[PDB]
Amino acid sequence: GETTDGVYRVMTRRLLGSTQVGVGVMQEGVFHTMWHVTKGAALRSGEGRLDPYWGDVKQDLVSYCGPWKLDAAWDGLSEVQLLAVPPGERAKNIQTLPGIFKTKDGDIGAVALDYPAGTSGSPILDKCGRVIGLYGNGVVIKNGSYVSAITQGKRE
């Protein structure tokens, strides 16, 4: 299968035609996506197979072929880019200044950009091109709009 670093669409042929259920990041031989995209199922890459390695429903994250590799963090001050990969549309960078999710266990960066559900797993980057988290798990605020957490895993 294709193991070159980069952003990938996650597709299924179970429904009508070929449907994009999400997106993920290939880095250092490991595929990273959100748990709600695959539900922890195996993935195909050409003629090859990718098996889940680590996952956690509460964090809404999953890694394939190896442990979670992404460890960059938002600096709390700078604008970032969502590399949105929407269903049936070209990958496109959107720059934004994150807001904050304030929780009882600490603060998390949040991006107030609204894309179709099939865009879940698109990476959010810092100015160095490092993935600081994945887009797609958030909340609907008092205007019908969407705000996603910047969801990042832990590198063991």
Partner 1 sequence: DMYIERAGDITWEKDAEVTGNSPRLDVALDESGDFSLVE
Ligand X SMILES: NCc1cc(Cl)cc(C(=O)Nc2cccc(-c3nn[nH]n3)c2)c1
Q: Which segment (2-10, 71-79, 101-109, 113-121) binds ligand X by CB under 6 A?
A: 113-121
Active site residue 32: no
Question: Which position among 27, 38, 63, 120 is part of the footprint of ligand X (CB under 6 A)?
Answer: 120
Asked if residue 38 binds ligand X (CB under 6 A), the reply is: no
What span, in angstroms and rounded, lies between the C-alpha atoms of 90 and 109? 26
Please answer whether residues 20 and 11 qualify as being in contact, where contact means their C-beta atoms are separated by less than 8 angstroms. yes
Asked if residue 71 binds partner 1 (CB under 8 A), the reply is: no
Which one from 18, 56, 71, 120 is the annotated catalytic residue?
120
Asked if residue 115 binds ligand X (CB under 6 A), the reply is: yes
Residues designated catalytic:
36, 60, 120
